[PDB]
């Protein structure tokens, strides 16, 4: 309802500033089709999302809100998206709309290694499925299409071959389903003409890996608009630091640095965000209010670091969930205020 101003993909990832990611709540998934819209959305444990919550984001420095969704409940034989499902998407959307945030909906569980995921960068999976992708992408696009440039669209998650295989395909030929499945959903998107004609929307890389070979065979696809598209990685790196390190050391922040410098060396001309990031390790072992002090400090110095150099490098970063979750959410109030303090301190000095 606010009217449509088109802008560059680079000024939408400038303006989100410091984002969070509204997790395991749309994209919670599991308890079969045909369930009330909110055991869905309770089924891991969130409360059901509010005004209050996008409200709270904004109020306390954060721009930018991403809201995973799985959708393969919600459909039908036929693909079609149950109507109380996308109704709902939408009022989170307005609620992140009304508060003054950016948001991005996308397609998560639906991918990688669940149960139920069913777009895989395999070439045979690809083409049983490319139908039903294009045309859950045209239904989330029709639906959404009305809000402004606030709203962007991320074609699918972290997308893995058949083998759920993490940082790599086992064969190449992955790479060309996925670079198929990403043209496709540009393409769906456009074709449904209005704002959606010229909405910035996001395309993510093999896993949401950022190593060489996932990079190099990485296709960017071809959008008849200019400056409309922007790249989507995950980071959690050092792979289970969480676990093993004391302190947010040299070696850490060198490894963020060369993931940065790799990422900028080869997008000059196209802006990328991190996604995701947070302590999530091995066994989806994370911090919480009730780690020790100096886990928390860890948390912290990953965050203010993440931010920093994401800036540095006109990038954006989106924090997975620990920072406002759970019964927090409702109150609302920050889980891990001194992990935002940080954040805010590295994002505006
Ligand atoms: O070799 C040691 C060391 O040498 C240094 O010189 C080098 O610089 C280091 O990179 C290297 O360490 C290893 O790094 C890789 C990742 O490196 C890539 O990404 C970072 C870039 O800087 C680098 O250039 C790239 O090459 C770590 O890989 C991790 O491995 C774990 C465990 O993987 C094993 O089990 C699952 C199986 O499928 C794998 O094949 C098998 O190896 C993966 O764990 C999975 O992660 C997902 C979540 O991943 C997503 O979120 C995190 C985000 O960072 C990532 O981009 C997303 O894809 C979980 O859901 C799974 O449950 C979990 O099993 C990691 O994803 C993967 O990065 C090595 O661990 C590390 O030793
Ligand atoms: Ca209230
Ligand atoms: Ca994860
Ligand atoms: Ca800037």
């Known amino acids: 309802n606010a009217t449509y101003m088109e802008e560059s993909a680079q000024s939408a ?28 959305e309770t089924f891991w444990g969130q409360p059901e999302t509010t005004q209050d919550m996008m409200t709270f984001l904004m109020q306390n420095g954060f721009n930018a809100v991403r809201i995973p969704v799985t959708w393969y409940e919600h459909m039908d034989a036929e693909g079609n998206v149950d109507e109380a499902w996308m109704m709902r998407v939408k009022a989170i959307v307005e609620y992140a709309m009304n508060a003054g945030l950016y948001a991005i909906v996308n397609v998560h569980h639906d991918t990688a290694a669940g149960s139920g995921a069913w777009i895989k960068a395999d070439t045979d999976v690809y083409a049983a499925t490319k139908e039903k992708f294009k045309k859950l992408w045209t239904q989330i696009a029709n639906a ?57 929307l996001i395309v993510n890389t093999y896993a949401a890996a950022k190593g060489e070979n996932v990079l190099n065979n990485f296709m960017l696809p071809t959008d008849a608009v200019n400056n409309h598209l922007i790249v989507q990685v995950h980071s959690y790196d050092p792979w289970n630091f969480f676990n093993t390190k004391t302190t947010w050391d040299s070696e850490c ?72 979750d759970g019964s927090d959410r409702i109150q609302p109030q920050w889980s891990l205020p001194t992990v935002v303090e940080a954040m805010q301190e590295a994002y505006n000095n």
Not at 21 to 28: H, I, V
Not at 278 to 285: A, F, K, L, Q, V
Not at 292 to 306: F, N, R, T, V
């Open 144 to 200: 959404l299409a009305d809000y402004d440039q606030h709203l962007l669209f991320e074609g699918y998650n972290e997308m893995l071959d058949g083998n759920n295989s993490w940082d790599e395909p086992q064969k190449a030929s992955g790479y060309e389903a996925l670079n198929n499945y990403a043209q496709d959903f540009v393409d769906a998107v456009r074709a449904t003409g209005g704002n959606n004609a010229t909405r910035n």
């Open 253 to 324: 922040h060198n490894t963020l640095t060369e993931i940065f410098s790799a990422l900028s060396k080869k997008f000059t001309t196209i802006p990328y965000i991190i996604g995701e990031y947070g302590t999530h390790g091995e066994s989806d072992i994370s911090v919480s209010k009730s780690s020790p002090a100096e886990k928390i400090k860890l948390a912290a110095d990953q965050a203010a670091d993440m931010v920093k150099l994401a800036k540095d490098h006109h990038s954006a970063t989106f924090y997975w969930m620990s920072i406002f």
């Open 13 to 40: 990832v400038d303006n989100f500033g410091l984002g969070f990611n509204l997790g395991n709540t749309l994209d919670a998934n599991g308890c079969g089709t045909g369930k009330p819209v909110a055991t869905y």
